[PDB]
């Protein structure tokens, strides 16, 4: 298995359509031993993760909670056993208040909302690395989830800004992680029909936002030389596993695009 | 003159070595009528700006102050006269708390500090555009100051992250500004020996941070095919004026590099 | 005038819808004294350039002709007067054989064709700089015309490759030009309905190629936050003049996007 | 094994310090069945490849030889057996005449030399894909070797231009390869001390070129958050294997940086 014997923390499972659910599933299929972290609805997440091919301890982690972070590494050490360290960390956490997205005018997002979004979506990549690098093995890998923010787009608004911040954070995290013999990288995924995405497409953030995202999705598959299946998170999970593996050992502070190649094509 | 008859708001003068001081001076040399905005030390800024080739009304603008922003356009209209609108807006505002920079470990910057930095340095580009676009003429130009954050670097830490955010914000601001027939662009300047920069070089944020920035500056001039004079903000002021002019009329959501060409060269 | 007193060589006029025709016209409107170079059909080009606001000596330059290049600087010196040097050079030259474009399969372009295309479209940027830098003044500016090749696109095929090469060449030209106190930059223009473009849209390189380019043009204006008018080369001519001016004095080895901001927007 | 059962053509072995030698070795260690191609010195290459963990048919391929390419797929089919197709293709071919590199002035490289360099180094990526895609399986992977040309650098001169062309070609190859369910990607490696590199460092292309490359190598390891060992091609071979695998299944027309993360860091 690709991740045989590796111990890997996977954050960001909330439903069985979470990208992190698929990351966790593929990692397990590939021999990894997981510790999961979950935000807020731990009973729900436990029930969801019961469906993973293997049992995995689930730890509460609200990335905005200083104490959760301060206790994180001890709790993980408790879960994987004293003397054992993590080989991988998957950050699959993102949030932006509604005012920072969709048809709420870009200018109308109050900074408190944007800040909370950037906190959860960007800064927490650094928070997590800070918490976990002390308990990571040399040759370890931190992976976060990105959505290519190099160009502006409708609807994603301040979440795109948050991702721009995240990409910058990742480069700094790589500098820190390198001290530990650890890589830090993002996977920039194509659009995936998670519950939230489906809700946006269905107009939850305004009809025009829904229409634009639908157009975005369609254009993505069109541009993607190998196509893009927004209903299938597996290619993205595999890519995350690729980075968690020993097979990209010279790649760090970097972004791997698991988007069907859409970003390399204009039309 | 390049900016003859144009009315332009210039934020960010704090000392006579502020990049915005030079932007204001060059703009005036080029025929622009200025409104200045200043943060906090208005008496100081007035005295500094007395040295500009022309008188310019100075308005208080704390970009974190909602009321300042809410009143901004009325105050500007008051200053330039009812029925007159702005042709240009220069955002030359940046701040990051000390914990977000220098030898304070990257991981040790508390999010409240980072957030304040991103507020002033990134989000305020959107705040300013929100406040001023209603009083900007078609063919207008918003320009913000950038420091190329595409690669991580020592010492600049969360300010680089803030600039990554700013670049993303600028692309969204362009979408909004385009509705007004207004361009929005950043000038990514090479390093300029402002007071703060000199202080960092002198070790104000730690000796190693100072040493790294010094190396950064030296490498910049070396890489720059036309050299880079960190003691001369004029080439950057001119570039900002170029964007404020009618001479880059098809450029928006974009970044103009006024850095000696350093970013185009590896070594 | 923006280019008052500057002496500027403008290559690439072939018809009155040549981007270089508009560059030459705007430069003249802005006070520049021009020397034109023309390829092959000098009688035609003379007649076309008779329409420029001012007379300009026209010199033959086949960029693939070593002797033309070897004699170029002497001929220019002859035209502008001994003791006078150029302040600006505009490279607005591009060609790719039909096999390298349109619906001719990408794989089917014979290398001899591609090579000729890269010769005229990329290498000649270096050839021209080699020929002219000895007769350029400090503070001079070389500008070439680019079409953003960072992402692949239908129909443009090997011309996109040629532009990728050109952008790389420009960065090297900047290193050389910097020795002379000369900047070297590209303007990446949006699509302009030159005769050739109109012919491609009309199906000259295959119906599907025509259909794709039409879609490309439509998407460009849609994405452009300030719109894009493919029938108007003036915004691009102005941008070239901006780079020929003293107003981007710290920009070199670089690309200025005169494309309505289209490249900064995904959708 | 990562590449278990996959049939993969590996071009570009010339010595046991060829990056392709290490790609071939790692691929074999990972279960791949190889067909090798070799240029010119087939007796030498056979003797070199005798050292690979497994036997592999060696086929002559001069990428500038139309007949070699025209016969290539039949010869490969002969070697792997009728009814069997390739799963992977590794392009590890590069050449630039001396005049296009080192201290030979950039402007002094005759186009015939540059063209030959671009032919072998860029166009041949398309030639190889053209030859081999008809005999590649869905889910296949074409990988070429890149050296990040996004910024100009000393000494590499027209080879950097060739790599810029190659990166553009790769994006087009992805469009074609996608029709076959095949990915096309580049690995941008850090500098590797191949024989040629060592010769350049030793001054084979001029002392200043040697000095600059040495500085380049040193800076690379310094910038690389996880360091860079130019004497070790394994991390790059592994990265190529990662792309040949099923583990980056949504990545195409893309560049994977196996450079220690050096390109993500300024200083
Ligand atoms: N769905 C899509 O189209 C794409 C999503 N992404 C990114 O993938 C990552 C995963 O999101 P998805 O799986 O799409 O959605 P999701 O909603 O399944 O996952 C987001 C996760 O973030 C967690 N989260 C929110 N606030 C948190 C906090 N304070 N502390 C800890 N965790 C918190 C949520 O509990 C949830 O598990 C995010 O970074 C997202 O931006 C990237 C590209 C595309
Ligand atoms: N000095 C350098 O090397 C470079 C600086 N820059 C950027 O140029 C811009 C101008 O900075 P400099 O002239 O270098 O330094 P500066 O310190 O002269 O200017 C920064 C300005 O930001 C203003 N500011 C801070 N907080 C504010 C708030 N809450 N509201 C309104 N204004 C506030 C300050 O009053 C000051 O006028 C900044 O965006 C900076 O990041 C960009 C590239 C290089
Ligand atoms: N039309 C468009 O949509 C865009 C064009 N460009 C570029 O702008 C530049 C100008 O082209 P356009 O004005 O569009 O077309 P054009 O056909 O008016 O100009 C191309 C010029 O290249 C010259 N040329 C061709 N072979 C030559 C040789 N061996 N020696 C000297 N000159 C030679 C032609 O004589 C012609 O004057 C080209 O680099 C083109 O790629 C860039 C972006 C968009
Ligand atoms: N050594 C380095 O620092 C780096 C090299 N690369 C690239 O890696 C690839 C492999 O080169 P290296 O292993 O470094 O050197 P190498 O000299 O071992 O390999 C180059 C190969 O190109 C082949 N070649 C040359 N002309 C050919 C033709 N007409 N037909 C077929 N093959 C031909 C040579 O026979 C040789 O096998 C090249 O694309 C090179 O640019 C990329 C990054 C760094």
* Domain C1-267 = CATH 3.40.50.720: yes
- DSSP per position, D9-29: EE----STTSHHHHHHHHHHH
Inter-residue contact B248 to C239 (CB < 8 Å): yes
Q: Which ligand is nearest to the CA of A123?
A: 1
Q: Which ligand is nearest to the CA of C233?
A: 3
What CA–CA distance (Å, rounded) separates D140 from D134?
A: 11
Q: Which of B171, B247, B259 sits opposite C238 (nearest CB)?
A: B247
- DSSP per position, C130-178: HHHGGGEEEEEEEEEEE---SSB-TTTHHHHHHHHHHHHHHHHHHHHHH
- Chain B segment 206-245 residues within 8 A of D by beta carbon are 212, 215-216, 219
Q: Which tokens sit at C164?
A: 């990728």
CA neighbor of C151 nearest in space, from B18, D168, A15: D168
Q: Which atom of ligand 2 is nearest to the CA of B62?
A: 30
Q: Across the beta sheet with C86-91, what order do the strands follow? A: C58-60, C33-38, C7-10, C86-91, C136-146, C183-189, C254-258
Q: Which tokens sit at D236?
A: 């790059």
CB contact, 8 Å: D264 with chain A?
A: yes
What CA–CA distance (Å, rounded) separates A74 from A52?
A: 24
Q: Which atom of ligand 2 is nearest to the CA of B20?
A: 13
Q: A188 alpha carbon to ligand 1 midpoint, in Å? A: 13
Inter-residue contact C35 to C76 (CB < 8 Å): yes
* Measured CA angle at D109 (ends D107, D111), to 5 deg: 110
What CA–CA distance (Å, rounded) separates D199 from B118?
A: 48
Inter-residue contact D133 to D172 (CB < 8 Å): no
Q: How many CA within 13 A on the CB side of residue C163?
A: 22
Neighbour tally for A53: CB within 10 Å: 11
Q: Residue B134, SS3?
A: helix
- Which stretches within chain D are classed as H helix? 19-29, 42-49, 66-80, 111-118, 124-132, 157-178, 195-201, 207-223, 234-244
Count A/B contacts: CB-CB distance under 8 Å. 86
The verdict on a CB contact (< 8 Å) between D242 and A242 is: yes
What CA–CA distance (Å, rounded) separates A217 from A210?
A: 11
Q: How was this structure determined?
A: X-ray
CB contact, 8 Å: C4 with chain B?
A: no
Contacts of D218 by beta carbon, 8 Å cutoff, 6+ apart: none
C-to-N gaps above 2.5 Å in chain D, after residues: none
- Ligand 1 binding site (Cβ under 6 Å of any ligand atom): A 12-15, 18-20, 39, 61-64, 92-95, 120, 145-147, 189, 191-192, 194, 196-197
CA neighbor of D53 nearest in space, from D33, D25, D20: D25
CB contact, 8 Å: C260 with chain B?
A: yes
Contacts of A12 by beta carbon, 8 Å cutoff, 6+ apart: A18, A19, A20, A37, A39, A90, A91, A92, A93, A94, A145
What CA–CA distance (Å, rounded) separates D262 from B58?
A: 45
Inter-residue contact A99 to A109 (CB < 8 Å): yes
Q: What is the resolution of this structure in A?
A: 1.9
- Which stretches within chain B are classed as H helix? 19-29, 42-49, 66-80, 111-118, 124-132, 157-178, 195-201, 207-223, 234-244
What CA–CA distance (Å, rounded) separates C47 from D175?
A: 43
- C183: which chain B residues are within 8 Å (Cβ-Cβ)? 226, 261
Q: Residue D99, SS3?
A: helix
- State the residue for tokens 């090297």: C172
The annotation status of D94 as a binding-site residue, yes or no, is yes
- C161: which chain D residues are within 8 Å (Cβ-Cβ)? 122, 165, 168-169, 172
What is the DSSP pairing of strand A58-60 with strand A7-10?
Answer: unpaired
Dihedrals phi, psi of C225, to nearest 5 degrees = -60, -25
What CA–CA distance (Å, rounded) separates A249 from D240?
A: 11
The ranges assigned to domains in chain B are 1-267
């Amino acid at each position: 298995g690709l991740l045989d014997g590796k111990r890997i923390l996977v954050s960001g499972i909330i439903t069985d359509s979470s990208i992190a659910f698929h990351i966790a599933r593929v990692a397990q299929e590939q021999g990894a031993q997981l510790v999961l972290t979950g935000f807020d609805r731990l009973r729900l997440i436990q029930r969801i993760t019961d469906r993973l091919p293997a049992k995995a301890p689930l730890l509460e982690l609200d990335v905005q909670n200083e104490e959760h972070l301060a206790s994180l590494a001890g709790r993980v050490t408790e879960a994987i056993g004293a003397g054992n360290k993590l080989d991988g960390v998957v950050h699959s956490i993102g949030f932006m208040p509604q005012t920072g997205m969709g048809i709420n005018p870009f200018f109308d997002a109050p900074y408190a909302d944007v800040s909370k979004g950037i906190h959860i979506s960007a800064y927490s990549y650094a928070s997590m690395a800070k918490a976990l690098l002390p308990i990571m093995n040399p040759g370890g890998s931190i992976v976060g989830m990105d959505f290519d923010p190099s160009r502006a787009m409708p609807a994603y608004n301040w979440m795109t800004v948050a991702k721009s911040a995240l990409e910058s954070v990742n480069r700094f995290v790589a500098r820190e992680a390198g001290k530990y013999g650890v890589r830090s990288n993002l996977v920039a995924a194509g659009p995936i029909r998670t519950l939230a995405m489906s809700a946006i497409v269905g107009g939850a953030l305004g009809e025009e936002a829904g229409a634009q995202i639908q157009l975005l999705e369609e254009g993505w598959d069109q541009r993607a030389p190998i196509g893009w299946n927004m209903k299938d998170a597996t290619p993205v999970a595999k890519t995350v596993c690729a980075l968690l593996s020993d097979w990209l050992p010279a790649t760090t502070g970097d972004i791997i695009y698991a988007d069907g190649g859409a970003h390399t094509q204009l039309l």
